Amino acid sequence: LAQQPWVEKYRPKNLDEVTAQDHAVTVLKKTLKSANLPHMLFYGPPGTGKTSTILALTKELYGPDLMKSRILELNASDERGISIVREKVKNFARLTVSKPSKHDLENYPCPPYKIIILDEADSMTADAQSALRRTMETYSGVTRFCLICNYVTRIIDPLASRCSKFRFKALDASNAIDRLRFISEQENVKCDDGVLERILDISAGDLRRGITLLQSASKGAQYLGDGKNITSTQVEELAGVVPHDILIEIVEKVKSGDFDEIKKYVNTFMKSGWSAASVVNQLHEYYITNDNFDTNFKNQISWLLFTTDSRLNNGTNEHIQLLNLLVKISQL
């Protein structure tokens, strides 16, 4: 087949192929049984199957052929704000509804409305969501909106009231690793022990990021050409994750507490090119979930890490911020 992202390639086709989402799948099947389809609001952890399930529902509603004409997939995270997204929605709604063929009508319901899908709707501002609600109520006759978001509480009350809400449970690690293993076996990807587990850990359970990272690792293995199994260090390099050995060395340097030793180690470390934000994230993960530190140490170090992350997010010098963070922790 032609080159295609593995995220789009391995989306479930129909509702019956969505795993670990039986509650939302059942409610959506019941809604599909009814002729009227209300506005929908898909929320849950990222990479659980929101877009996959809405696409499967659309394909069951319209059929594989008519689906492309009745769907406007938009992402609300793009800049220029309300104007572009609302103008595109208005143009799609004012566009004449495509006439289904004889085959489409006899085999699929082909309802007379066109589904509009907004991704990352929670990132919209309050004014943007109010304008979206205005647009939804203006063209409510011929368009049904589906909002995909991670947090339902970020959606304003007037907009959330108009939409039936479907909660997607976070994927069990077993289900995610089984899906990744199936994808790897289908694509003939050689992996060592714990490579898929490492991919899931790096992606924090996000199956979308896990699939993307697996595809990148497969491409890197093809580039290497040796035919050997993909290793954990390769996926760590691809994801921009500092090796655990360097993190342990940083922890030991902090524990010793010498200012000059810490400064020298940070100077050496900044030459390797590892991202400082990744170091801060991994230090947070190591220290917070460690049973060898008491409550007061974690109370202080959480604020230290928060301050360092806030300063790093402002576009500052990584070397100075990392050195300050490591020096402050060594004094705890």
Binding site: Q3, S77, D78, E79, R209, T212, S216, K219, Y223, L224, G225, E237, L238, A239, G240, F259, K263, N267, M270, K271, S272, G273, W274, S275, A276, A277, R311, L312, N314, G315, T316, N317, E318, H319, I320, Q321, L323, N324, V327, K328, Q331
Partner: protein
């Protein structure tokens, strides 16, 4: 200059980071399926050289037939903008951060023009980490749209300012700075090519250590030292440092020696002199901080206070507008903690 005369013009001519060279050679073996690249690492390590070497491996030596042109763009309020675009018969190089916040429209217009004019043409974006978030979103949209004819090779020093959506669509490649042995080998090759007399090879090791892994800095330092010593480097030959670094070290010694308001006024004068001659404020702050931390007379408490104030005022510089306001505050805070 020797830094430019002996720059590797091909993937075979690279001498350090062998694994990265092998990876880049494999990428050129399949030109059709070339992914978008994001190259990150310390400054002066060979990122641009490797970009050009990969381009030469794909398209041939014609990538080095570079010509420069000025493209004129217009924005909403008829503000004519000019951007310098270095072009070849095969690729383009742009630095949209030169346009400030107007980088978004420039990127959109130029990428649309290149896509319309078109197997594909590579666009190299320098200082990708300093792009605005809106510009990065526009770059992601152009990646999604014109991926058939446009392949992006972004170069940055830190990958953190890059937005997450871009990172997923690009191949992250890490360029560690060369070790001291590799820098010494490169300098040895340069001095053998230029016929420079060396009393001992330890001179090259000292130059490598003084450069702190910056290959460009080490090469330029070697050239400067050779010219000073009549093309004959001795074991007693001093390491030559740039003028601004010498000024900053003098300022550090002045701050450590005396801590008073008059000293602060004279430090203000020195900082004005440095800023007026195209020395960036962040560079001044970093050099001043790391010169202060190297003073032997200071104790642990003083150094901790210095690094904390450096972090605070680095954030304030990034969020600020007038550079001299923050550097003076940092120096004033440092003087109080030492006294």
């Amino acid at each position: 200059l020797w830094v430019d005369k002996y720059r590797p013009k091909s993937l075979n001519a690279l001498s350090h980071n062998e694994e990265l060279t092998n990876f880049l050679k494999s990428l050129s073996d399949q030109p059709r399926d070339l992914p978008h690249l994001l190259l990150y690492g310390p400054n002066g390590t060979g990122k641009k050289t490797r970009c050009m070497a990969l381009l030469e491996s794909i398209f041939g030596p014609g990538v080095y037939r570079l010509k420069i042109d000025v493209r004129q763009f217009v924005t909403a309020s008829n503000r004519k903008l000019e951007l310098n675009v270095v072009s070849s018969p095969y690729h383009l190089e742009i630095t949209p951060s030169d346009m400030g916040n107007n980088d978004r429209i420039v990127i959109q217009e130029l990428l649309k023009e290149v896509a319309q004019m078109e197997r594909y043409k590579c666009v190299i974006i320098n200082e990708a980490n300093s792009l605005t978030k809106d510009a990065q979103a526009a770059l992601r949209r152009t990646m999604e749209k014109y991926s058939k004819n446009i392949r992006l090779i972004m170069v940055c020093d830190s990958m953190s300012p890059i937005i997450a959506p871009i990172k997923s669509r690009c191949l992250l490649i890490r360029c560690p700075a060369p070790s001291d042995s590799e820098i010494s080998t490169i300098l040895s090759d340069v001095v053998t090519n230029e016929r420079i007399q060396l009393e001992t090879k330890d001179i090259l090791k000292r130059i490598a250590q003084a450069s702190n892994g910056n290959l460009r800095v080490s090469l330029l330092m070697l050239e400067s030292m050779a010219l000073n010593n009549e093309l004959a480097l001795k074991s007693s030959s001093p390491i030559i440092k740039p003028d601004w670094i010498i000024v900053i070290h003098k300022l550090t010694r002045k701050i450590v020696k005396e801590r008073s308001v008059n000293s602060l006024i004279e430090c203000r004068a020195v900082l004005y002199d440095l800023l007026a001659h195209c020395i960036p404020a962040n560079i001044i702050l970093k050099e001043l901080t790391f010169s202060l931390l190297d003073v032997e007379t200071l104790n642990t408490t003083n150094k901790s206070s210095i690094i904390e104030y450096s972090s605070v005022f680095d954030e304030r510089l990034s969020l600020g507008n007038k550079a001299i306001f923050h550097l003076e505050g940092f120096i004033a805070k440092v003087m109080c903690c030492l006294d």
